[PDB]
Design a protein around this ligand. Structure first.
Ligand SMILES: CCCCCCCCCCCCCCCC(=O)O
Lengths: 252, 237, 267, 54, 237, 60, 54, 54
C-alpha cells in the first residue's frame, strides 16, 4: 500500500493515510554547501534541529467563489521560532524546503486544486507605470488571494491579480512545468513537495529576495449538496531543510 | 605573398554562420561553474510535460478558469457527444497555446505520436464509462457513436484510478507534417462520447467536470526553425 | 540523437493496465502507442539535433538601432546595454530562468544625405568609431572630447564599404549565471526599485563620426546584433502570453487564454 | 587539427587560431538527453504496468 | 590561385587585437639586457604594500598633513567612537586615493580580503585599549559599542608592539564585487571605539595620534580593465 | 476516533515543556513537540511524550 | 608550428612568418609572481607568530 | 585531406571546411551505367542470335 507516509523532522511528525507520491524537486535532494562552491570564507552555523522542523501557517477557507492564494516562501517563516531569529542576526543563508498542503472532505464533495512551486515569480502592477509595493506582494504567514476580476488602473501600487494570467502574464494551464501535485477530493487528501536550493549564487540575503512562491489554484470549484458541511479549510506546513548562515552582525 | 583568389560569398553577413572572431577582452577569468538544479539540454524535454488544454472556449469562457473544464451531466438518453476538435497541434486554437503547441510554433515540420490524458474531477460516489476515439482523415467527422467506434478508440471505466491515456498513433503518408494549416497534411479528429450514463446517489451533485492534458511521446521531433506569430512590436520599449 | 523505434505487439488479455494511471502524483505517464493497440516494427531514423539549446539560441538577432548626425552640435549616440527593448529576443531568452553564454557582436552601419544648400557636394569615405565604456569610467560629453582617447576602453574603427565589424565577448558576470527574472529589491529596507533593474550593470556603447562636416550634413544609423555561443540553461519557464509594455518590469494588461469558437463540438 | 564527422542524413578539419577559448566556434554537436528530471520527479519509482496506487 | 572567402571582421581596427606585423627597421641589434633591481611582473605586487589612509578629511585638513592623523584624548565617560567609514575601496573618498584604491580604479571587478594596520604614535608612558570592528550589511551602522561587538572585532592592547592588524574577511554572496558604488554589492562598515581610557602620567601630553594603513591579502584579484576617472585634458600639452 | 465511517478530520497533538506558560494558540503549540494525526482507516494514533528533565527522577 | 594551451575558465596553433623577433605577437601568458622584494625587504627574516622586537 | 585523380584526356587535394554535408562541392565523378532496366525490361532473357518467337 503506497497510500501511507510518515515524515519525521526534529521533534515533529506528519502522518497521512491517503496520499499520492512525493515529488522531489528536479530530481535533487537538499544538501549542505561543498568546499568547491563556497565563497564566504568564515565558518557557517548549522543549528539543524532548532530550525529544521515543521512550522504551520494560518488556514484559509475554500469557498465556492474562490480564486486562489499565494505565499512568498522565505517571508512567511520570518517570525517563526528560531528560524526567524537567525535571519535577523545573519547576512547570508541558504535553505531547502519541504511543503505539505492538506485538505480533507467527504465522499460527497468535489473539487480540484493545483499546488505548484514557482522559482523567481516576479509579479506585475495594475498601473502600467509603477511596480507593486511590499504590503501587497507578501504577508506575514497570511495568504494573499487572487480574484476573478481585473484590478482597475485607477489604483497606483497594487498587484494585477487576474487568475488566468497567474499574476505574471503567462497562461495558467502551463504552470505544470514547475514541480507540482494535484489534490483531487475524489482520491487525494494532501500533497508533498521537496525543493532544493535554487539560485544563481551560492548564498543570498533572505530579506531582500524571495526565491520561491507557493500557489494554490482551484481549477474545478468546490461543490456539495444541501446538508453537507459548508466549511472546508486548507492548511500549509513548511519545514526548512539543511539550513546554514553566515555573517553575524547586529539585529537589523 | 601566397597567391589566393576570393569566391562569391565574401564580405557578407549571414545571420546563421559559424566562424571564429577575435576577442575584445583578452585573458579574462570567468566565474567558475556551479551545480544549479534543472538543466535543459534539449527542447523536447519541455514538450514532453503535461499541460491543461482549454477545450471549452465558447465565446465567453476565455477570460476565466472555465475554459479548462468539460461539463458532464446525467442524461435521459444514450450516445451523446461530450467534445470534439480537429488534431492540429499548431494551427487549431484549442491546442495552440499549450506547452506542446508553443514549441511547435517556432518550427515548421513535426513528426511523432501525441498523448492525451483525461482526469475525472467528480464526486467519489459517481460512476461512468466513456469512449475516446480518433478518426484519420478521408471521410468527414463522425456524427454518431456508431461511426466513431470504427476508428481507434479506448473505453475508459472510471473507478479508483482517475486517469486514462489515449495515445494518438502516427498514421501518415509522409515522414513529416506541416505545422501551419494544410489540407494535404491533415491529421484527423478527436471525439468523446457517452458509453453509459453518469449514475449518482442521492444528496450528490449530478454535474461533474473533466480535465484534459496533452504531451508528446518519445518519438516526437521537430525541424526547420522559424519565428513565432504570437508577439508584436511597434516601437522600442 | 536518434529517436526510439516502434516495437511489434500482440493481442493481450491480462492484469496489466498501461492506459490507467493517476495524474495526481505530478508524474507524466510513460506509455508508448505499442501498449494500447497492435503495432508493427518500424525503424526510426529521425534525430533531435535541431531542437538543442545550442541550435535554438545561436542565431543573430537585432537588439537596437540608433542614429547620429554629422552637422550637429553634440551629434553622437549612446546606448545602455540590455536585451529587453525588442520583443522577439526577449521572448526566446525568457523561456529559462538562468543562462550562461559567450557573445558575438556585429554592427551594420549605413548613411544618408541630408538636404544641404551648397552646390557641388562631394564627400569622401566615412569612418566611424564605436566605443565601449565599462561602468565607472569617464563618458564623452561631446564629439571633440578627451574621452575618445580609448587608452584602455576597447573600441573599433571601420571604413564604409567593407565587411561588417565583429568581435567576441566572454561570459562577463559577477554571479554564476545571468538572471532573466529577479524577485526582490535593491535596498535592505524594501523600498524603491523592484525587479530586474537591480542586476543590470553592463556599460554603455558610444558612436560617432571620425571625419569632419565638409560641405553637407550626413545622418548615419548603426544596428546591433547579438549571438549567444556556448550556451547552458536551467529551470524552464512558461512562455509569455500578454504583450510587453515596458522595459524595466513585467507589467501587462490581462487577455484571454486562447481565441474562441462557437461550440464545444465544432470541428 | 581536429578531424570530426560532419553530420549527414565524410570528415572535416578544424584548427583554432586565437588564444582565448571564447573565440572558438559554436558547439552545435552536443546531443544529450535527460527528460526524466522533468517528467518523473517522484521519490518511489513507478512501473508502467502496475497501478499507481495500491 | 587558392580559393578563399573573406568573413565579417575584415579591414577593421580593434584596439586590443593580437596579430603580427612587418618590421619597419629590419635586422636591428638591440642593446643587451641589464639586471636592474626591482622588476614588476604583476600589478598585484604594488597593491599589497601598505599606504597611509586619510581618515580625517573634515573640510579643511585636506590641504595639510593633518588628514592622516586620528585624534585621541582622555575622556570623562566610556564607549565613545573614534572613527568610522564604509568599506568601498574604489568609490568612498577615504580609501579612494591610496595605493590599493588607485589600482582598483583601472578595473571593474574585485575580490579578496583587505588588511588594516593601526599604529599608536603617542608617548611611551600612555596606555589604552581599543576595539576595531567590522559589520556586514543588512542592518545600518552601529551606534554603540554594544552593537559593534556583535560583528567581527579584535581588541587591541597598546604596549611595546605598537601595531595591530584587523583582517577584513571576504563575506559576499557572489564571487566578485563592483568597484563603482552599487547597493546590490555593498560591503559594510568599519568602526573604532574606546574599550578603556587613555591613562597618562603627570607632565605628559594627553592628546595622542593614530596612523592607519591599508593593503591587500594574497587572495586579492581584479578583472575587466577600464579607464580611470582621475585625469582630465582639454588641449594637447 | 469513535465517529462515523464517512467523517474526516485532522488534529494536532502537542506537548510543551515548562518555563513558559500554557500555549493559547495553535501557533504557540506547534513550536513544541507535536504530531499531526490524519483520521482514516487506521483509527488510532500515539503521541509519545519523551523524557525531558534536568534530573534523573521526578516527584510524584 | 607551436601548439599551446588556450586559456579557459583545448589547443591552438601558432606559426611565425617574419624574420625579426620584434614582429611576433604579444606574450600574454607569462604568469610569474615575486611580491617578497617589495613587501618584505628586510635583512633578518621575520616569523609571523613570533614578536617583531625581542 | 582527400587526394583524387584529376580527369585528363596528376592529382589534386581537397579538404572540407564546414560541419554540414550539404556544404560540400559537387560530386562530378560518379560514372555508373545501368541501361538494361530501360532497354530490356522483359521477364525471360533474349539471346541476340536466336529468334524472338519460337
Ligand atoms: C566594442 C566592444 C563592445 C563590447 C560589448 C560588451 C557588451 C556586454 C554584453 C552583456 C550581455 C548581456 C546579457 C543579458 C544580461 C541579463 O540578462 O541580465
Amino acid at each position: 500500500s503506497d497510500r501511507v507516509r510518515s515524515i519525521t523532522l526534529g521533534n515533529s511528525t506528519i502522518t497521512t493515510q491517503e496520499c499520492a507520491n512525493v515529488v522531489v524537486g528536479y530530481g535533487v535532494w537538499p544538501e549542505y554547501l561543498k568546499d568547491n562552491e563556497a565563497t564566504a570564507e568564515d565558518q557557517p552555523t548549522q543549528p539543524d534541529v532548532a530550525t529544521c522542523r515543521f512550522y504551520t501557517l494560518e488556514s484559509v477557507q475554500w469557498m465556492k467563489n474562490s480564486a486562489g492564494w499565494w505565499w512568498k516562501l522565505p517571508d512567511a517563516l520570518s517570525q517563526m521560532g528560531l528560524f526567524g531569529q537567525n535571519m535577523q542576526y545573519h547576512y547570508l543563508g541558504r535553505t531547502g524546503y519541504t511543503i505539505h498542503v492538506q485538505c480533507n472532505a467527504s465522499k460527497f464533495h468535489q473539487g480540484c486544486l493545483l499546488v505548484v512551486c514557482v522559482p523567481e515569480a516576479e509579479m506585475g502592477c495594475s498601473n502600467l507605470n509603477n511596480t507593486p509595493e511590499f504590503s501587497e506582494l507578501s504577508g506575514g504567514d497570511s495568504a494573499r488571494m487572487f480574484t476573478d476580476t481585473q484590478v482597475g488602473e485607477s489604483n497606483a501600487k497594487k498587484v494585477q491579480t487576474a487568475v488566468w494570467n497567474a499574476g505574471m502574464g503567462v497562461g495558467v494551464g502551463n504552470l505544470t512545468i514547475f514541480p507540482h501535485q494535484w489534490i483531487n477530493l475524489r482520491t487525494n487528501n494532501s500533497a508533498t513537495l521537496v525543493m532544493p536550493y535554487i539560485n544563481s549564487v551560492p548564498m543570498d540575503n533572505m530579506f531582500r529576495h524571495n526565491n520561491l512562491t507557493l500557489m494554490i489554484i482551484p481549477f474545478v470549484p468546490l461543490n456539495y449538496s444541501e446538508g453537507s458541511s459548508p466549511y472546508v479549510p486548507i492548511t500549509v506546513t513548511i519545514a526548512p531543510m539543511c539550513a546554514e548562515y553566515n555573517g553575524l552582525r547586529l539585529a537589523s | 605573398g601566397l597567391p589566393v583568389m576570393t569566391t562569391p560569398g565574401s564580405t557578407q553577413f549571414l545571420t546563421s554562420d559559424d566562424f571564429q572572431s577575435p576577442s575584445a577582452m583578452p585573458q579574462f577569468d570567468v566565474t567558475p561553474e556551479m551545480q544549479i538544479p534543472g538543466r535543459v539540454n534539449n527542447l523536447m524535454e519541455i514538450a514532453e510535460v503535461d499541460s491543461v488544454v482549454p477545450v471549452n472556449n465558447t465565446e465567453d469562457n476565455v477570460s476565466s478558469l472555465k475554459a479548462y473544464q468539460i461539463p458532464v451531466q446525467s442524461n435521459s438518453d444514450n450516445g451523446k457527444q461530450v467534445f470534439g476538435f480537429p488534431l492540429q497541434p499548431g494551427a487549431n486554437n484549442v491546442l495552440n497555446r499549450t506547452l506542446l503547441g508553443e514549441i511547435l510554433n517556432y518550427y515548421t515540420h513535426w513528426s511523432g505520436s501525441i498523448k492525451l490524458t483525461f482526469m475525472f474531477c467528480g464526486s467519489a460516489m459517481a460512476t461512468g464509462k466513456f469512449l475516446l476515439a480518433y478518426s484519420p482523415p478521408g471521410a468527414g467527422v463522425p456524427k454518431n457513436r456508431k461511426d466513431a467506434m470504427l476508428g481507434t478508440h479506448v473505453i475508459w471505466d472510471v473507478g479508483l484510478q482517475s486517469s486514462c491515456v489515449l495515445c494518438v498513433p502516427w498514421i501518415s503518408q509522409t515522414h513529416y507534417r506541416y505545422v501551419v494549416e494544410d489540407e494535404y497534411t491533415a491529421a484527423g479528429y478527436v471525439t468523446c462520447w457517452y458509453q453509459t450514463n453518469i449514475v449518482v446517489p442521492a444528496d450528490v451533485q449530478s454535474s461533474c467536470d473533466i480535465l484534459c492534458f496533452v504531451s508528446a511521446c518519445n518519438d516526437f521531433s521537430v525541424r526547420m526553425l522559424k519565428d513565432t506569430p504570437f508577439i508584436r512590436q511597434d516601437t522600442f520599449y | 540523437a536518434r529517436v526510439a523505434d516502434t516495437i511489434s505487439s500482440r493481442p493481450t488479455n491480462s492484469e496489466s493496465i498501461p492506459a490507467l494511471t493517476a495524474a495526481e502524483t505530478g508524474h507524466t505517464s510513460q506509455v508508448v502507442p505499442s501498449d494500447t493497440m497492435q503495432t508493427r516494427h518500424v525503424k526510426n531514423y529521425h534525430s533531435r539535433s535541431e531542437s538543442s539549446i545550442e541550435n535554438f539560441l545561436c542565431r543573430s538577432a537585432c537588439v537596437y538601432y540608433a542614429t547620429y548626425t554629422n552637422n550637429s552640435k553634440k551629434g553622437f549616440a549612446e546606448w545602455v546595454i540590455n536585451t529587453r527593448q525588442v520583443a522577439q529576443l526577449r521572448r526566446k531568452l525568457e523561456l529559462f530562468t538562468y543562462l550562461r553564454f559567450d557573445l558575438e557582436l556585429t554592427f551594420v552601419i549605413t548613411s544618408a544625405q541630408q538636404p544641404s544648400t551648397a552646390s557641388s557636394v562631394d564627400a569622401p569615405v566615412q569612418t566611424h568609431q564605436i566605443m565601449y565604456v565599462p561602468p565607472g569610467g569617464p563618458v564623452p560629453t561631446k564629439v571633440k572630447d578627451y574621452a575618445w582617447q580609448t587608452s584602455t576602453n576597447p573600441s573599433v574603427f571601420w571604413t564604409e564599404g567593407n565587411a561588417p565589424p565583429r568581435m567576441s565577448i566572454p561570459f562577463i558576470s559577477i554571479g554564476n549565471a545571468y538572471s532573466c527574472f529577479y524577485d526582490g529589491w535593491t535596498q535592505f529596507s524594501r523600498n524603491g526599485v523592484y525587479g530586474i533593474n537591480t542586476l543590470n550593470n553592463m556599460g554603455t556603447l558610444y558612436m560617432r563620426h571620425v571625419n569632419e562636416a565638409g560641405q553637407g550634413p550626413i545622418k548615419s544609423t548603426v544596428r546591433i546584433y547579438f549571438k549567444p555561443k556556448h550556451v547552458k540553461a536551467w529551470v524552464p519557464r512558461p512562455p509569455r502570453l500578454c504583450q510587453y509594455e515596458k522595459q524595466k518590469n513585467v507589467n501587462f494588461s490581462p487577455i484571454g487564454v486562447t481565441t474562441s469558437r462557437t461550440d464545444i463540438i465544432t470541428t | 587539427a581536429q578531424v570530426s564527422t560532419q553530420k549527414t542524413g565524410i570528415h572535416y578539419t578544424n584548427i583554432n587560431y586565437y588564444k582565448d577559448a571564447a573565440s572558438n566556434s559554436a558547439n552545435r554537436q552536443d546531443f544529450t538527453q535527460d527528460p526524466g528530471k522533468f517528467t518523473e520527479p517522484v521519490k518511489d519509482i513507478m512501473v508502467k504496468t502496475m497501478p499507481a496506487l495500491n
